[PDB]
Amino acid sequence: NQALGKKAISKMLNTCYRILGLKPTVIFADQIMYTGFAYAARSGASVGI
Amino acid sequence: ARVTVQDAVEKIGNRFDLVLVAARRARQMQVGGKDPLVPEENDKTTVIALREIEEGLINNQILDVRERQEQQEQ
């Protein structure tokens, strides 16, 4: 329930590691990268003059 | 296939000793004279030995006792 600006996301990965373990954290990291790429492409964010 | 070796690490906790134990088990299964104690999914001997350690049915002590048993048999 935040904006997740690269400081919340590393914190959430850290908490996942410290609470759940190693392998769930690996699965979570892979899924995070997949969904981040997918929704960045869906977002269509671009720079203009 | 063992993507992560965490289970084997907690089974025998050193992260350095299981390499040696699994190397010994893989050598036994690969040179010859031994068969896997876990179902074979056409894996290499490496992850097979790692799975055997993870299941809790292979370690250093029982490897030594099996070697002693084989020596006593002959």
Curated annotation (Swiss-Prot), chain A:
Biotech utility: Co-administration of salinamide and rifampicin or salinamide and myxopyronin suppresses the emergence of resistance to both antibiotics.
Residues forming coiled coils: none
Disulfide bridge map: none
Post-translational modification: Acetylated on several lysine residues in the presence of glucose.
Highest taxon of source: Bacteria
Function: DNA-dependent RNA polymerase (RNAP) catalyzes the transcription of DNA into RNA using the four ribonucleoside triphosphates as substrates.
Similarity comment: Belongs to the RNA polymerase beta' chain family.
Quaternary structure, from the entry: The RNAP catalytic core consists of 2 alpha, 1 beta, 1 beta' and 1 omega subunit. When a sigma factor is associated with the core the holoenzyme is formed, which can initiate transcription. The rRNA transcription and antitermination complex (rrnTAC) consists of RNAP, NusA, NusB, NusE (rpsJ), NusG, SubB, ribosomal protein S4, DNA and precursor rRNA; S4 is more flexible than other subunits.
Protein name: DNA-directed RNA polymerase subunit beta'
Organism, scientific name: Escherichia coli (strain K12)
Gene: rpoC
UniProtKB/Swiss-Prot annotation, chain B:
Name recorded for this polypeptide: DNA-directed RNA polymerase subunit omega
Function: Promotes RNA polymerase (RNAP) assembly. Latches the N- and C-terminal regions of the beta' subunit thereby facilitating its interaction with the beta and alpha subunits. Part of the processive rRNA transcription and antitermination complex (rrnTAC). The complex forms an RNA-chaperone ring around the RNA exit tunnel of RNAP. It supports rapid transcription and antitermination of rRNA operons, cotranscriptional rRNA folding, and annealing of distal rRNA regions to allow correct ribosome biogenesis.
Reactions this protein catalyses: RNA(n) + a ribonucleoside 5'-triphosphate = RNA(n+1) + diphosphate
Record EC number: 2.7.7.6
Keyword RNA-binding: no
Entire protein: shown range: 2 to 75 of 91
Family from the record: Belongs to the RNA polymerase subunit omega family.
Cellular compartments per GO CC: cytosol; cytosolic DNA-directed RNA polymerase complex; RNA polymerase complex; transcription elongation factor complex
Top-level taxon of the source organism: Bacteria
Molecular-function GO term, any one: DNA binding
Keyword DNA-binding: no
Assembly notes: The RNAP catalytic core consists of 2 alpha, 1 beta, 1 beta' and 1 omega subunit. When a sigma factor is associated with the core the holoenzyme is formed, which can initiate transcription. The rRNA transcription and antitermination complex (rrnTAC) consists of RNAP, NusA, NusB, NusE (rpsJ), NusG, SubB, ribosomal protein S4, DNA and precursor rRNA; S4 is more flexible than other subunits.
Organism: Escherichia coli (strain K12)
Gene: rpoZ
Gene Ontology biological process terms, A to Z: bacterial-type flagellum assembly; bacterial-type flagellum-dependent cell motility; cell motility; cellular response to cell envelope stress; DNA-templated transcription initiation; intracellular iron ion homeostasis; nitrate assimilation; protein-containing complex assembly
UniProt keyword list: DNA-directed RNA polymerase, Nucleotidyltransferase, Transcription, Transferase
